[PDB]
Design a protein around this ligand. Structure first.
Ligand SMILES: [Cl-]
Ligand SMILES: [Cl-]
Ligand SMILES: [Zn+2]
Ligand SMILES: [Zn+2]
Ligand SMILES: [Zn+2]
Ligand SMILES: [Zn+2]
Ligand SMILES: [Zn+2]
Ligand SMILES: [Zn+2]
Ligand SMILES: [Zn+2]
Ligand SMILES: [Zn+2]
Ligand SMILES: [Zn+2]
Ligand SMILES: [Zn+2]
Lengths: 85, 85
């Protein structure tokens, strides 16, 4: 975040993120069994897609809201930074 | 997986067991837009479902096979490191 954010911008950013706001045990059970059960692993993977979906949507909506409180200069810089991360 | 004092045999066995960009650009387009298009976002998120599936399945089967070449004492170490992650 090397974009020279106005202090009104960071306030806007805090409110954005705070408004953005288990499965690992099943993964462990799959890895640590005597045999690899492919159908059971397919079902775990499919269940992980529901959480991935919710997390990607949150991430992308958050970053879209940040981008749109930016000036044309800050946007250009954000986009260059995106290309190199 | 803070390593586990693998034996020579185990190093060979792991050796044997062990035998993109378009998606980030689409995420970029969704983020750097003057509105957040949730429908297009859901489509983007789902596009690589089959590739993610084949990748996770491979990874999970690899990790299950490595787990099962471990000694009882290495299994306990691997399982305790799994719980603190
Ligand atoms: Cl766990
Ligand atoms: Cl990109
Ligand atoms: Zn089964
Ligand atoms: Zn919302
Ligand atoms: Zn072998
Ligand atoms: Zn390509
Ligand atoms: Zn890009
Ligand atoms: Zn584009
Ligand atoms: Zn649309
Ligand atoms: Zn699907
Ligand atoms: Zn399929
Ligand atoms: Zn196989």
């Amino acid at each position: 975040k090397d974009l020279n954010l106005t202090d009104a911008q960071k306030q806007q950013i805090r409110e954005i993120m705070k408004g953005q706001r288990e499965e690992r045990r099943a993964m462990h059970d799959i890895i640590a069994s005597d045999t690899f059960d492919k159908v059971k692993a397919e079902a775990q993977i499919a269940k992980m897609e529901e959480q991935r979906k919710a997390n990607m949507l949150a991430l992308m909506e958050t970053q879209n809201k940040i981008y749109n409180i930016l000036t044309p200069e800050q946007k250009k810089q954000f986009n260059a930074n995106f290309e190199k991360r």
